[PDB]
């Protein structure tokens, strides 16, 4: 499975979803997550995220390992999203800012 990590938070561009043949992205107020059981590892979503926030589960940075479990868990409670939407208003301002996990909304 592929995993959405820290730089997605407060950006949430949503270009990722248009690439997904199986529709396994789930939406939060300021973050997206992939469902690990539905994802087929097609990788088609990774070169298309402007925030370079998606990684193969085995290529997820040492300092972001907690996102693997977070994607699995929130994918069970958030609604599916299959259509591209406008990025969050100040996405450029937040793209590249580290430790944005402190800003994650449920
Ligand atoms: S790797 Fe493929 S199946 Fe998994 S979330 Fe990305 S586009 Fe969807
Ligand atoms: S910012 Fe988040 S919404 Fe999709 S396009 Fe990147 S994983």
UniProtKB/Swiss-Prot annotation:
Region entry Disordered: which residue ranges? 83-106
Quote any Pfam family the record assigns. DUF3470
Q: Which cofactor does it need?
A: [4Fe-4S] cluster; [3Fe-4S] cluster
Keywords attached to this entry: 3Fe-4S, 4Fe-4S, DNA-binding, Electron transport, Iron, Iron-sulfur, Metal-binding, Repeat, Transport
Q: Any keyword Mitochondrion?
A: no
Whether Nuclease counts among this entry's keywords is: no
Q: Cofactor comment in the record?
A: Binds 1 [4Fe-4S] cluster. Binds 1 [3Fe-4S] cluster.
Domain called 4Fe-4S ferredoxin-type: residue spans: 1-29, 30-59
Classification via Gene3D superfamilies: 3.30.70.20
Feature: compositional bias, Basic and acidic residues: 95-106
Residues bound to [4Fe-4S] cluster are: 20, 39, 42, 45
Q: Which GO terms describe its molecular function?
A: 3 iron, 4 sulfur cluster binding; 4 iron, 4 sulfur cluster binding; DNA binding; electron transfer activity; metal ion binding
Q: What does this protein do?
A: Ferredoxins are iron-sulfur proteins that transfer electrons in a wide variety of metabolic reactions. This ferredoxin could play a role in regulating gene expression by interacting directly with DNA.
Kindly provide the name given to this protein in its UniProt entry.
Ferredoxin-1
> Which organism encodes this protein?
Azotobacter vinelandii
What are the top taxonomic ranks of the organism? Bacteria, Pseudomonadati, Pseudomonadota, Gammaproteobacteria, Pseudomonadales
């Amino acid at each position: 499975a592929f995993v959405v990590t820290d730089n997605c938070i407060k950006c949430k561009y949503t270009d990722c979803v248009e690439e997904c043949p199986v529709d396994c992205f789930y939406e939060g107020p300021n973050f997206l997550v992939i469902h690990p059981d539905e994802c087929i590892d097609c990788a088609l979503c990774e070169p298309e995220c402007p925030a370079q926030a998606i990684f193969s589960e085995d290529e997820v940075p040492e300092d972001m390992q907690e996102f693997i479990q977070l994607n699995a868990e929130l994918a069970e409670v958030w609604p599916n999203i299959t259509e591209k939407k406008d990025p969050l208003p100040d996405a450029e301002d937040w793209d590249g800012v580290k430790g944005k996990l402190q800003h994650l909304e449920r």
